[PDB]
Amino acid sequence: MAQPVIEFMCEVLDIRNIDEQPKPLTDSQRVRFTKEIKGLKVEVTHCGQMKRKYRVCNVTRRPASHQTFPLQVECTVAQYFKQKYNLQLKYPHLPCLQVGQEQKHTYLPLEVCNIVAGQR
Numbered sequence: 001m002a003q004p005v006i007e008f009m010c011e012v013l014d015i016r017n018i019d020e021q022p023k024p025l026t027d028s029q030r031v032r033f034t035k036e037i038k039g040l041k042v043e044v045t046h047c048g049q050m051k052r053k054y055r056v057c058n059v060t061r062r063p064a065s066h067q068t069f070p071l072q073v074e075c076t077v078a079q080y081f082k083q084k085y086n087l088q089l090k091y092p093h094l095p096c097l098q099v100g101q102e103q104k105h106t107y108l109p110l111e112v113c114n115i116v117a118g119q120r
Helices: 005-013 027-037 077-083
Strands: 041-044 053-063 068-070 074-076 095-099 106-109 113-115
Touching: 005 027, 005 113, 027 053, 053 106, 074 077, 077 106
Parallel strands: none
Antiparallel strands: 041 053, 041 113, 053 095, 068 074, 095 106
16 A cells, blocks of 8 residues: 555654644754655655656755746646645645656645555
C-alpha cells in the first residue's frame, strides 16, 4: 500500500497532533523532512485512477498557500487545487514537494501525495 506523505512527514518530524498544530514547519523541521523525502517516488491522488508518479527532488520553503508558479501570469498552488480541482487544501501552511526536472519547477501539495513503495 502507498503511505500518505503527510503521515510519512509526521513520522519523520515526530508529530502525532498534525491536526492540532496548524503551525507551519520550522526551518529545522523542513530540512529534516527534505532529507527523507528527497529522492523517494510519489504518486498523485487527486486525479482518480490517473495516479501519475513523480520523483521528489526537493521541498519548497514557502507553504502551498504562498508557493507561486508560472500559470498559463503567476498563481498559487493552493489556488490551483481549489480552482482546477475544486479542493481546499487541508494544510496550505505546509510546504509543497518539487517533482520532476528541477528547471521544470513543478510543485505538488503534500496532501495529494502518497509514497510509492518499491516492488522488487
